[PDB]
Amino acid sequence: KKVVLGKKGDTVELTCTASQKKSIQFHWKNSNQIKILGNQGSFLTKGPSKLNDRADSRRSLWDQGNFPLIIKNLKIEDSDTYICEVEDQKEEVQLLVFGLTANSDTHLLQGQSLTLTLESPPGSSPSVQCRSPRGKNIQGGKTLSVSQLELQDSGTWTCTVLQNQKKVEFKIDIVVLA
Amino acid sequence: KKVVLGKKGDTVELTCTASQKKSIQFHWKNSNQIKILGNQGSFLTKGPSKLNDRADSRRSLWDQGNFPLIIKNLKIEDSDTYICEVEDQKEEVQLLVFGLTANSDTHLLQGQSLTLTLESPPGSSPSVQCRSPRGKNIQGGKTLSVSQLELQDSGTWTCTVLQNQKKVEFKIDIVVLA
């Protein structure tokens, strides 16, 4: 059971490392036993999955017994358990996908509030921890909010989201307009 | 001891998969105990290696305990044993690098000879096996040569080079001009 955290619109690479004669039949399935991708002889076959055009692998690593599932342009909808069946064995990976917005623009006026919201899949309520460039931090679970923006908030904010031990770091630039 | 075969001007990715708390101190060294790259806290540090600007890793895989050494624009000179030291353990990978030319152009005249030469590092004499698009094959050890080009040689040739079990496939298009 491996837990990998991705970021909305980002690419993640789920790892699969077997222990057989450098590269042999394998394939990625979703908890739903749907085939995402596998190798056909020596080729690469992706079935009609919703991840069809955004899914790939690194075909030259199979020789090393590595069969990565690459997933570009990440959606919170891809969150899910992916299974990697390499000949006799199978690896299970849980992909948790997150997004983090700032409904205000990033260019606000001193005194105005700031609202950030974390987009998560029906499966999580994580630890959001954002710091002003000024050391001050705000924690939450979905909705964040700071009540008075100082000119001392301008900069670049760091939002740490935490899950089963793992963590994703988000960075936002807020322009506090005088 | 892992043997990976690369191709002149190509990129290879040497794999390193440990068994510790998702991502901890690691680094790649060459047989010569020279540091190629490692992680400094959480950053990426490449020393002054000859592979300095062509060397990389995939920094978001360390969380999965994978510490790849990527090496772009391959040279036969990069052939060598690379060691991957991940905390308590270390993996050794032998990178054999090959090139395969066709000293004639690829556009020859029927009747003319074809000479292909395999570029290898001082460490190998491999099995070169090239097939005309017409099933006929020519084997060698460094220098290949076909004495009479038929119009039945036009196409795309497949040159298989073999080493410790591994193999690299090269493909050349010869234009047999009538």
| Cα distance between residue A163 and residue A95, in whole Å | 11
Please indicate if any CB of chain A lies within 8 Å of the CB of B17. yes
Domains in chain B, please, with CATH?
A: 1-98 (2.60.40.10), 99-173 (2.60.40.10)
Residue type, A104: S
| Cα distance between residue A144 and residue A32, in whole Å | 34
Q: What is the DSSP string of B53-114?
A: TTEE--TTSGGGTB--EEE-S--GGG-EEEEEEETTEEEEEEEEEEEEEESS-SEEETT--B
Judge: A166–B60 Cβ closer than 8 Å, yes or no.
Answer: no
Closest Cα partner for B61 from A51, A93, A99? A93
Please indicate if any CB of chain A lies within 8 Å of the CB of B61. yes
CB contact at 8 A, B130 and B160? yes
Judge: B60–A15 Cβ closer than 8 Å, yes or no.
Answer: no
Residue type, A141: G
> Which pair of tokens denotes residue B142?
């460094």
Residue type, A34: I
- Which method was it determined by? X-ray
Judge: A15–B166 Cβ closer than 8 Å, yes or no.
Answer: no
**Alpha carbon B80 to its chain's center:** 11
Judge: A2–B60 Cβ closer than 8 Å, yes or no.
Answer: no
| Cα distance between residue B107 and residue B18, in whole Å | 49
| Cα distance between residue B10 and residue B32, in whole Å | 23
Residue listed under structure tokens 């900069």: A155
Sorted by sequence, the CB contacts under 8 Å of residue B84 that are 6+ apart come out as B14, B16, B26, B27, B28, B67, B69, B90, B91, B92, B93
CB contact at 8 A, A50 and A74? no
Please indicate if any CB of chain B lies within 8 Å of the CB of A138. no
Residue of A nearest to B19 (CA): A17
Residue type, B27: H
Please indicate if any CB of chain B lies within 8 Å of the CB of A70. no
Rg, chain B, Cα only = 20
Residue of A nearest to B166 (CA): A63
> Which pair of tokens denotes residue A35?
């085939």
Give the number of beta-carbon pairs within 8 Å between A and B: 33
Sorted by sequence, the CB contacts under 8 Å of residue B102 that are 6+ apart come out as B114, B115, B116, B172, B174
Judge: B17–A22 Cβ closer than 8 Å, yes or no.
Answer: no
Please indicate if any CB of chain A lies within 8 Å of the CB of B59. no
Judge: A17–B13 Cβ closer than 8 Å, yes or no.
Answer: no
Interface test with chain A among B42, B59, B61, by most A beta carbons within 10 Å: B61
Judge: B166–A63 Cβ closer than 8 Å, yes or no.
Answer: yes
Judge: B64–A15 Cβ closer than 8 Å, yes or no.
Answer: yes
Residue of B nearest to A10 (CA): B60
| Cα distance between residue A1 and residue A85, in whole Å | 13
Residue of A nearest to B66 (CA): A15
- Report DSSP state, residue B5: E
Please indicate if any CB of chain B lies within 8 Å of the CB of A20. no
Count the alpha carbons within 13 Å of B86 in the hemisphere toward its beta carbon: 22
Q: Smallest Cβ distance to A17: which of B13, B17, B63?
A: B17
> Which pair of tokens denotes residue A119?
């987009």
Judge: A12–B66 Cβ closer than 8 Å, yes or no.
Answer: no
CB contact at 8 A, A31 and A121? no
Please indicate if any CB of chain A lies within 8 Å of the CB of B24. no
CB contact at 8 A, B128 and B140? yes
- The 3-state secondary structure of chain A, one letter per residue: CEEEEEECCCCEEECCECCCCCCCCEEEEECCCCEEEECCCCCCECCCCCCCCCEECCCCCHHHCECCEEECCCCHHHCEEEEEEECCEEEEEEEEEEEEEECCCCEEECCCCECEEEECCCCCCCEEEEECCCCCEEEECCECCECCCCCCCCCCEEEEEECCCCEEEEEECCEEEC
Interface test with chain A among B2, B14, B60, B74, by most A beta carbons within 10 Å: B60
